[PDB]
Assembly symmetry: D3
């Protein structure tokens, strides 16, 4: 799934759309998305002036947006997140977002999310969503 | 503590500085900060086009930035977050960020964070930080 | 009137929409709007680098936009303004915009505008509008 | 006076610096500045989506910034403005800002300002300033 | 052709629309467009911090956009450019873009482009376009 | 060479810095840089609204910035460019910028530039630079 289709599937848009492509999709089970990290993204100017580092909370948003694509291809709001920020992410990194569905019911979903650069895990999370 | 002092204390800057004022400060114990939510903030255009709602992850960042002010007045990176997004936040809301220190050691800190609009709690979190 | 309705009523949009909510409305007579002042608004970076202060001219625009909501609920262009900038406005302030209709005719309107933080008046203005 | 010198003289900066060049300068008396109006300026996206028109309040800010250059070559804050918005200004216009000093004292200054496109006057104003 | 019509004719939009007006049009032959250069355009902050100078590549884009208007009034993508950057362009300059059609076929077009400030040539280019 | 060092070496900055990392460096001979293409870069909103495609002129700027790093490690202004835009570039692409020095003299330099996604060439250029 390329960016033009991602734009349609993800309700977020610039400057808060943090998916570039879908790499792998197993409906009702798992998705793998790609987000390129670029020094020309607007948030880097503020985090931090002396040192550009991807904010951990935006990796969480990227994992949430990847999940939403998985849900739509199988209004969701993030309801909870339990997240470990293991390693920093920098301009020039390719961020791989892997979502596995834990449990989906009519009203909610719980997923496990892993963000990777290369095959080093930089962020791990459990997320839940409520329909709204 | 007014915004000009906040600017100095918080290493983040526009468009990723999410504190306006410090309302209450008890060194080594607790801080209460204020963030005004304005429809003229850049993230609202992308979250969401049809419906401006404050992203939950940016409330987490605001709680993390409030914590950093508490630490500095008593390089911190968010190391973990366990967060419940209870209620939505809108342009025109005044977001109150309350941080209580759970445990501080030389290398890390664990805090409990509550975000409120009025005296309704909209977000509750446990956050941990590592020195870097 | 909440922000989603304000967005529709006010033709301006980001980064030039300076109303968050309507607090009070008496058709054909008076309106009270709220604009949250946030350090994360784009104009603060340029006014001024060393010292964030709300530009007086944007308080005038906010008063003009509040007036337009009053007109619409009872293409307007600001035709004249006679304004006194009494006190400065800062990130973290809640700006209250009070408009009283002086005279409305088919082609024009003259209003008196008061901007307040708390119940201190920070700006007072007489504004006129022409239909266009 | 070219833009690089204007940048230094005017404390405002992007996105709130509304002078490009100084065309004429008579110390203690009069200044003529130029501001190019470009469709690629950020405020046009919001004023208005269907129709790009220069906001009258930003012409007032440009007149105020021209005045400040005159003062500096002979912290000023706009204290009052009495302004008539006669004609609209569009992308592609060259806005000429003419300031004549009415009265300068140690604490304040009163000026008359005229904004022109070609030699048609689009805005006329009396402005006052207080030292701060 | 004024900016509102330019907006419709040129598929690019803010922050990548670099035409303000069409000054002269001879269908199937030549066009002259105007782009005002303003210090309040977003690219100047990054090119360069110490010294605002219009990037040569954006003059090429402006010449390409002028060409597209000529084509439409008589999806085009720039296919090739052979360009000489002779003189620098600054905030406050009025950039005149002159396009002469060399050869148009069903699938492609080759044009000669000249950018001028006053009647000094600042950029000269041969451009080709392919339909897409 | 990582982004923090790139920031220092390249005089351009956000929103006009189009290098993320240096991948390969042979002083006085060749450089290979990486620019991640992200849908969250500000230029995509304007090029084009219906269809995000990297502007060819910004690939030229990226090649020019890669060249400048090569020059500095062995004020440069682009003096000429002769460029072929062969294939389009999209959000999610990793753009590889390869510069080979043709000739360097005290006053000028001529280089050959190739931009690649994967190992498909998307842009080829000859560029010249003059010291300034």
């Amino acid at each position: 799934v390329n960016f033009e289709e991602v734009r349609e599937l993800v309700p977020q848009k610039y400057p808060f759309l943090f998916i570039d492509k879908v790499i792998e999709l197993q409906k009702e089970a798992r998705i793998v998305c790609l987000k390129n990290i670029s020094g020309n993204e607007p948030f880097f100017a503020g985090h931090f002036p002396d040192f550009a580092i991807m904010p951990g909370v935006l990796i969480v948003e990227a994992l949430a947006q990847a999940s939403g694509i998985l849900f739509k291809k199988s209004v969701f709001l993030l309801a909870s997140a339990n997240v470990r920020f293991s390693k920093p992410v920098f301009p020039g990194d390719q961020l791989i977002l892997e979502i596995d569905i834990e449990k989906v019911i009519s009203s909610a979903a719980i997923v496990k999310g892993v963000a990777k650069v290369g095959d080093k895990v930089v962020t791990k999370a459990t997320l839940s969503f409520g329909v709204a």
